[PDB]
Design a protein around this ligand. Structure first.
Ligand SMILES: [K+]
Ligand SMILES: [K+]
Ligand SMILES: [Mg+2]
Ligand SMILES: [Mg+2]
Ligand SMILES: [Mg+2]
Lengths: 53, 98, 48, 36
RNA sequence: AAAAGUGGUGUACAGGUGAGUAUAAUAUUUUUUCGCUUAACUUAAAGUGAAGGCAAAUCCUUCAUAUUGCAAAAGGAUAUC
């Protein structure tokens, strides 16, 4: 019985990591999109603000 | 939809009803989930009472009926009028005074 | 001086400057949330 | 055998997660600059 | 105001028959332990914004917003000043 509990517990530890890493590597890609979309918007929005001084 | 309704039994010109808990979309006289009581519409008269007063015999398991009304059972208009007399629900209809 | 002068001086330069800055404030809010979310995941990895 | 491959992999994510938080910060304060 | 419709719900209930069908099966009872449930019923909370297509819509298509990020909605009606 101890082998089943130990074997099952280790299986959960392998999942939480595979889930956190998967979610982590996903937020990175979602974060890069925010960058490319921000540099363009910021460059386009600051331009207008620069013509209203 | 659970409903507290009546199942018409008896013979021709001798109506007799079962107060039952059944799903709305089922046959009137099909075996219900529970039989909460009985209802006799024809009013009776006490044997040795010469006053002329009549009464109606109605057997009802109030404790079992309150649980179904509490979980969301929908009694028909006839069963609603009965449950309002015993003092469980409020009447749906009343005699206009004006 | 007069209504026409004061009314002509006023223009959309202030209104434009306000709308653009406001859109950037909500933009930084989306970045702040995203940057915050990454922190909630960074401390969990090194934790486990 | 396999531990060495996963331990280093975690460092990569910890590294990238540090860079992304740096870019999003480089833009956050940048927006504040032009906002003044 | 009528007459056809479009949409919503219901025609998954009720009622009828016994032609076919030859069975042990992911059948069933008891105890212990559980999981699922986007319609209807009951209690409560929050949200009910913007376009296009059909003659029009609570029809169809789609968007914004909804703990993080993916993921929704539809309007109609009656009073008061
Ligand atoms: K049927
Ligand atoms: K048969
Ligand atoms: Mg200008
Ligand atoms: Mg038969
Ligand atoms: Mg609306």
């Amino acid at each position: 019985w101890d082998a089943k509990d130990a074997a099952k517990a280790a299986k959960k530890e392998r999942k939480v990591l595979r889930e956190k890493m998967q979610a982590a590597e996903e937020a990175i890609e979602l974060a890069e999109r925010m960058a490319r979309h921000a540099v363009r918007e910021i460059a386009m929005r600051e331009k207008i603000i620069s013509l209203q001084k | 939809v659970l409903k507290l309704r009546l199942a018409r039994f008896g013979r021709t010109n001798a109506p007799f009803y079962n107060i039952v808990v059944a799903h709305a979309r089922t046959a009137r006289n099909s075996k219900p989930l529970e039989v909460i009581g009985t209802y006799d519409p024809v009013p009776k008269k006490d044997t040795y009472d010469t006053t002329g007063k009549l009464h109606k015999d109605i057997k009802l398991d109030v404790t079992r009926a309150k649980y179904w009304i509490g979980v969301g059972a929908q009694p028909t208009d006839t069963v609603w009028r009965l449950l309002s007399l015993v003092g469980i629900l409020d009447p749906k209809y009343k005699k206009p005074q004006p | 001086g007069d209504a026409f002068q004061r009314r002509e001086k006023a223009n959309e330069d202030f209104a434009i400057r306000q709308r653009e800055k406001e859109k950037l404030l909500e933009l930084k809010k989306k970045l702040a949330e995203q940057q915050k979310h990454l922190k909630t995941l960074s401390d969990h990895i090194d934790e486990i």
